[PDB]
Amino acid sequence: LLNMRLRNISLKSEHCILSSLDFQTSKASEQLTKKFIYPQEHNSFLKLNFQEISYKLIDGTSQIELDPICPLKVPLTAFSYDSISATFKLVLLPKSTQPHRVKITLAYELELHPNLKLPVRTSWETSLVNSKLSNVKFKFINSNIKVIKGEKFTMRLQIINSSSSPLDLVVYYNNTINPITLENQYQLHNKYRKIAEGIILLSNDYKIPYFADLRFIGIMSGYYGTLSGLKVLDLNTNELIEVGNGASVLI
Amino acid sequence: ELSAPDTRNDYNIRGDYIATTPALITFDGNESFINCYEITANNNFDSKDIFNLKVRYNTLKEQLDCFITDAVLIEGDVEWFILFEKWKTFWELEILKKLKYDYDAFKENRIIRLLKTSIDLNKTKSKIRNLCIEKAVLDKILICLNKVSRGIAVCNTDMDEYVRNLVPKQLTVPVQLPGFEQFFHVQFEQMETSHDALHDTIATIGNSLSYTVIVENLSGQWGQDVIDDGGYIFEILSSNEWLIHGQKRCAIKEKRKEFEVHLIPLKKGYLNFPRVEITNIN
Amino acid sequence: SSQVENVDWIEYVMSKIRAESNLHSRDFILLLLDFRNSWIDGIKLNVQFEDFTSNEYHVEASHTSRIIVPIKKIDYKKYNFENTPIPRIFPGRQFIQSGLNEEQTIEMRQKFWCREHIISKLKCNWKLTTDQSVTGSVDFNKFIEKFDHKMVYTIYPGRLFYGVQLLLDEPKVKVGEIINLKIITEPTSTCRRKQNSTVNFLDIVIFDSKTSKILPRSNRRILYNGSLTKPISTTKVSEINLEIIPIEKGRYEFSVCISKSNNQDGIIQFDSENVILSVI
Amino acid sequence: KMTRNSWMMLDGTKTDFHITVRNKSLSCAINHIKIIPMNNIEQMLKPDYWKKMPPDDLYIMEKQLDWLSKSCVRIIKLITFDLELDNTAVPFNFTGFDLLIEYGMSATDESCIYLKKLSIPYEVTLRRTIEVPSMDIIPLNELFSSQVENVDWIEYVMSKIRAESNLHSRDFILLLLDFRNSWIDGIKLNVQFEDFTSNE
C-alpha cells in the first residue's frame, strides 16, 4: 500500500451527507522508492490517477460527484474529490466500494499496473422546535434564510397542536436589554443590544385564533440567526415558550 | 523611538511614539501596553540590520516623591531657603524608606502611604540638629501623608523637567525565514448550502526549515456551517510546490496545506523569506 | 439608502439628514405606540407630532397598528429638568413633609417632566369610515401611564453618567495611514453623584463590522500606539486620543466603555456610539 | 402533513420523498408536474346537487363517504422521488371537507400490469373567509333624474335607458345579497355580473 487514504462523510440536516475520500501517497513507501529513484536519477514521479468512481449498494452504480476528475499525474500530491450522496431517512447505512486506479508511469516511461479498488462500510459516524407543556410545534412556512433591505417584510409561522384547548397563546418581542472577564462583559451586552434593537414587531400581543402572519420591520442590519427576542406564551400556566429559530440577513 | 540602523539604508518608518503630554502609565502587566511601528522598504529588500529604541522610562516612586518634596513640604521661599536648605541629604535618607502604597495610586487616590511608623523617625529627627520649624514642617508633611489622597493634578507639573530620564536601549534585528516564494490560488464556491457569506483572510506566511512545509487555512464563516465546500485549482507560480486537496471543504476542518518548502529554493528578494498566497472566488 | 422613501417615517429623518447636516443621525429615537379600538367601525388615524404627518391608517375592530412616531432627543444643557417638581394646580395647601428621600424626588421629577414633554406636542386626529363626518381627536393624559428606567434613558440622555462623542476623520483608509481617533467626553448632570472617585477608566473596544470581539493583541487588524485604558477627569471635559495603524480587513466599529475602577463588575456605562471605518 | 388554506387556488410542493422501490436511484422517466387535485370535486359536487334537486334516494346518496377525502390518484411509468407541484385549486369545497389522500401508482412493465400502491395522509382545514347567507329580490319603478350618477348601480340602467330606448325601465330588478365575513381581515369585494362593475 502506497497511497494512504481516509473516508470522510459529513452529515447535514438538510437531507444531505456528502462523501470525500482523501488520498495522499505518504512518506512510508516514499522514503524507499524515491531513493531507489534518486539512485536512478528521478525525484518527480507520475502515477497517472485518472480512473476512479464510487459504488452505492449491490447495484454498483457510479454516483455523480459534485467535483471533476481529469488526468491527475504529478509528484507528492494529495487529492480529495467531493461527491454528493443522498441522506437516508434512518440508520440504513449503505456500505460502499471505493474504486480507483492509477497507472504508475514510472521513470524511463515505465508503466506499472496498479489500482486502488476496495470496499468497506460507509457509515457517517454521525425549522421545528417542540413544546414543553402541550402538543404544540412551531415552524416557519417561509424559508428561514431570507433576503431583505431595511424595509418591510412578511413572515409566517406554523402553529399545530392538539385541539384540546387549541387557543390562547400570545406573542411579544420584548425589546429591552437583558441587563447582564471584561471583553465577554462587553460581548454579551453587544449581543443583547443588537437583539433588542434590530427588528421591531409591528403587531405584538397578537392573539392567535392555525395560521398567523407575524409582522416585523428591521432597523439595523446584520445576520440575525436565531432571532430570539420573540416569545409566545400560554395564558393558562404561564411558561416562557421561546421560538429560537429563523434568520434574516438585511443586505 | 525606534532607531534606523547605522548603515542609514533607507528603511523608512511611519509611526513613532512621543508621549509629550501623556507622561502617564502603570505597568502591572495585567493591563497591556503595546507599541507598534510600521517599517517600510528601501530600494533593496534585505534581512539583517540593527534596531534600537529609546525607552525613556522613570519610576512612580520618583514622581510622587518629587511631588511630595516640592508641594507637600517645601513649596515656599522660606522653608526651602533656611529650614530644609542644607539638610536635604537627611530628607533624601528619610524618603527612601517611606514605601508609598501604589495599589491605590490609580484608584481614587494618589500619595497614600502604607502602614509604616513615625515615632522612630521623629526620634531620629530629634537626635540630629534639626530646628523646631523644620521639624514642624516635616511632622506636618508626614502627618498629612499618614493618610492622604490626590487627583490627577500635577501629573507633570510636579516633574516639569525636574526629573532624570533613564533612557534604555535594546537590540531587535528583524528575524527572517528560510524559503521565499509566491503562490496564487483560485477559489470556486461550489456550495452545498446557498452561501455562508464568509469573511476573508488573504494570508501571507513564512517557513524556516529545510525539507519543510508551509501550510495554510481558508476563510472563516459564521452561517450554517460544515458546508460551502469550495472548488479549487492550484495554479501556483514561480516554484515547484505540493498539494493537499482539490475541491476541498470549508467545514469545521479545512487542512488546505501546501508543503512547498521541500524543494524550489530561491533568493531573499523580500524583507524576509515569505509566501503570500491569494485565492479569488471564481 | 435611497428608494426607501416609500415609508412615511423614513423621509423625515432623511429630509433633515440631507439638509441641516449638524443634526446627525443615531440620536433620533422612535416612540412606538399601539392603538386598539373598542368599537365596530373603522378609524382613520392621522397622527401629528410638531411636524410629522402619518398616512391614512385603518383599524377595523380589534387589529392593533403600532404607529412608529419619530422624534428627537432633548438636550440636558438646554432644559433644566431639576426645576420645582410636580407643580400643584392651585397654590397654597397644608405644606406637609414630602416623606420621601431626596434621590427619590430626583427620579420622580425626571419621570414626570419627560412624560409631559412627550404629551405636549403629540396630537392624534381621526375620522370614522362609515360616516366620514364625525371627526375627533384624543388626548394621552390618561393613556401614558408612567415611565420606567429604559424610557428615561432613551429620551433623556442626561440620566447617563457620561456623555461622549467620537469622530474618525476620512473613513476611507487604504492600509498605511496612522490616523488619530478623537474622543470628546463631557460628564452629565449626574456629576454631583459620586465625587469620591475622581478618576474613571475608558476601555476602547474594537468590533468587526460583521463578526464580534476582536482580541486586544489585534494582529492583522488595527494596531494601536498607546494603550486602551486612558483615565478621564470627572467634572471636566477631556480629549483623549489614540492612533490607529490598520493592517487588512474590511470595516470596523469603535466604541467606549466606562468602568469606575479596574476591578471586575464595577462597570457603569455600556456606551454605544460605534463609529465604523472602511479599510481596503 | 400540510396545513390550512383559504379559498384561493394555491399549490403545494411537499418535501419528503416516499419509498417507491425499483431497481435503483435511476430516473423514473415520467414525472408529473401539474398534479391538479380538486378537479374531481367539481364533477362530484355538481352531480351531487343536481340529483339533490329531486328528493334524495339515488345511489350517489347511498351511504357514500368519499367526500370526506375526495382522494385522487397519480399514475406514472417505469427509486425515491420528491413530491411534485400540486396546484390544489380550492374554490368549490364543501364545509365537510377536511382531509385528502394520494394513492400514488408506481408503474413498471414489460407486457404486464405490474404496479403497487403508495399512500399519503393529508390533513387540511379551511378558512371560512366570506359568506352570503341570504338574498332577496326587489323590483323598481322610478326613472332617476340627473346628478344621481354618483352611485354605482344607477348608471347602468341610466346608460341603457338613454341609449337603446326599447329596453325600458320598470322591468329591471335588483337582487340584494349580504356578505358577512368570518375572518379578522378586511375584504375588498368587487362584484361582476356580465357587465356590472361594483366599486371597492
Q: C183 - beta bridge partners?
A: C166
Sign of the alpha-carbon dihedral angle for A37, A42, A45, A46: negative
Instruction: Tell me the one-letter amino acid at B116.
Output: K
Element (H, E) at D156: helix D154-162
CB contact at 8 A, C62 and C36: yes
Residue type, A142: N
Question: Which residue shows C-alpha cell 431639576?
Answer: C82
| Residue from the list C64, C216, C270 with its beta carbon closest to the beta carbon of A203 | C64
**Is the CB of B17 less than 8 angstroms away from the CB of C211?**
no
Give chain C's radius of gyration (CA, Å): 24
Task: Provide the grid cell at B216.
Answer: 495554510
C114: number of Cβ within 10 Å = 20
Q: Please tell me which residue of chain C has the smallest CA distance to B204.
A: C220
Ramachandran area for residue B37 (φ above 0: left; ψ -120 to 50: alpha; else beta): beta
Q: Which of A152, A193, A202 sits opposite C66 (nearest CB)?
A: A202
Which chain A residues have a beta carbon less than 8 Å from that of C259? 182
- Residues 6+ away with beta carbon under 8 Å from C22: none
Show the cell assigned to B119.
Answer: 515615632
Which phi-psi region, left, alpha or beta, contains residue D47 (left: φ > 0; alpha: ψ -120 to 50)? alpha
If you compute the radius of gyration of chain A from its CA atoms, what whole number of angstroms results?
A: 28
Longest dimension (CA), chain D: 80
Instruction: Say whether residue D4 is in contact with chain A using an 8 A CB cutoff.
Output: yes
Q: A17 has which bridge partners?
A: A11
Measured CA to CA, the distance from residue D70 to residue D22 in angstroms comes to 28
Which residues, at least 6 apart from B238, have a Cβ–Cβ distance to it below 8 Å?
Answer: B181, B182, B266
Subunits in contact with chain A (3 or more CB pairs closer than 8 Å):
B, C, D
- State how far the Cα of C146 lies from the Cα of C142, in Å rounded to an integer: 10
- Exposed/middle/buried for residue B280 (C-beta within 10 Å: 0-12, 13-18, 19+): exposed
Between strands D99-101 and C241-246, the pairing is unpaired
Q: Which residue has the cell 513615625?
A: B118
Question: Alpha helices of A84-214 — where are they, by DSSP H?
Answer: 185-198
Interface test with D, best of A14, A58, A61, A213 (most D CBs within 10 A): A61
Long-range own/partner contacts, residues B127-130 (CB < 8 A, 24 or more apart): B128/B87, B128/B90, B130/B87, B130/B90
The reply to whether residue D186 touches residue C62, judged by beta carbons under 8 angstroms, is no
CB under 8 A, 24+ apart: contacts of D17-20? D17/D80, D17/D81, D17/D82, D17/D83, D18/D80, D18/D81, D18/D104, D18/D118, D18/D120, D19/D80, D19/D118, D20/D79, D20/D80, D20/D81, D20/D104, D20/D106, D20/D118
Residues, chain B, total? 282
Residue D150 DSSP class: T
Q: CA C163, C169, C172, C173: dihedral to nearest 10 degrees?
A: -110
DSSP C210: S
Q: Are B36 and C262 within 8 A, CB to CB?
A: no
Please enumerate in sequence order all residues whose Cβ is within 8 A of that of B248, keeping only pairs 6 or more positions apart, or say none.
Answer: A80, A82, B218, B229, B230, B232, B254, B255, B256
Q: Taking CB atoms and an 8 Å limit, are D3 and A57 in contact across chains?
A: no
In 3D space, the residue among D89, D92, D131, D10 whose CA is nearest the CA of residue A156 turns out to be D10
Breaks (C-N over 2.5 A) in chain A follow: 126, 180, 209
Note whether B193 contacts A14, CB cutoff 8 Å.
Answer: yes
Rounded Cα gap, residues A7 and A93, in angstroms: 14
Cβ atoms D173, D138 nearer than 8 A:
yes
Is the pair C, D in contact (3+ CB pairs within 8 Å)?
A: yes
Are residues B257 and B215 in contact, defined by beta-carbon separation less than 8 angstroms?
yes
Helix (H, G, I), strand (E, B) or coil at B136: helix
Decide: A241 and A132 in contact? Cβ < 8 Å.
yes
| H or E element at residue B140 | helix B132-144
**Contact check, Cβ <8 Å, B107/C199:** yes
Interface test with A, best of D24, D79, D124, D126 (most A CBs within 10 A): D24
Radius of gyration, alpha carbons of chain D: 25
Supply the DSSP symbol for B5.
P
Pairing of strands A169-172, C29-35: unpaired
The alpha carbon of residue C73 is apart from the nearest alpha carbon of chain B, in Å, by: 33
User: Which other chains touch chain D, taking contact as 3+ CB pairs less than 8 Å apart?
Assistant: A, C
A20 touches chain B (CB under 8 A): yes
Q: CA distances (Å), D189 to each of B272, D153, D180, in order?
A: 78, 15, 11
Report the C-alpha gap between C160 and C189 in whole angstroms.
9
- Please state whether beta strands C29-35 and C222-225 pair in parallel, antiparallel, or not at all (unpaired): unpaired
Question: Please, what is the angle between helix B119-127 and helix B132-144, to 10°?
Answer: 160
Burial class (CB in 10 A: 0-12, 13-18, 19+), A179: exposed
Query: B108 and C197: CB-CB below 8 Å?
Result: yes
Largest CA distance in chain B: 92
Cα-Cα end-to-end distance for chain A: 52
Q: By what method was this entry solved?
A: cryo-EM
Resolution (angstroms) stands at 4.3
Contact A/B (≥3 CB pairs under 8 Å): yes
Cell reading at B277: 498566497
- The rounded distance, in Å, linking the Cα atoms of C268 and C153 is 13
CA-closest candidate to residue D44, choices D82, D81, D96: D96
**Chain A residue with minimum CA distance to B198:** A223
Give the chain A residue nearest C5 (alpha carbons). Answer: A151
Nearest to D129 by CA among D176, D175, D179: D179
d(CA A182, CA A192): 16
Cβ neighbours of residue B181 closer than 8 Å, sequence gap 6 or more: B238, B239, B241, B260, B264, B266, B275
**What CA–CA distance (Å, rounded) separates D148 from D144?**
7
Residue B239, Cβ neighbours under 10 Å: how many?
19
Chain A segment 126-155 residues within 8 A of C by beta carbon are 149-152
Residues of C in contact with B28 (CB under 8 A): none
Q: Which amino acid is at D124?
A: V
Residue D31 burial (C-beta neighbours within 10 Å; 0-12, 13-18, 19+): exposed
Return d(Cα A215, Cα A199) in angstroms, integer: 10
Spell out which residues of chain C touch residue A183, defining contact as CB-CB under 8 Å.
205, 213, 215-216
CA distance D24 to chain A (A): 7
3-state class (DSSP) for residue C15: helix
Report the SS3 class of residue D5.
Answer: strand
The answer to whether the CB of C192 falls within 8 A of the CB of C251 is no
Angle, CA of B89, B94 and B97, to the nearest 5°: 135
Chain C positions in Cβ-Cβ contact with residue D185 (cut-off 8 Å): 60, 63
The dihedral of CA B144, B145, B148, B149: what is its sign?
positive
Q: Which residue of B has its CA nearest to A72?
A: B246
Cα Rg for chain B, rounded, in angstroms?
Answer: 31
| CB spacing of A182 vs C212 below 8 angstroms | no
Say how far apart CA B167 and CA B178 lie, in whole Å: 35
Measured distance CA(C177)–CA(C171) in Å, rounded: 11
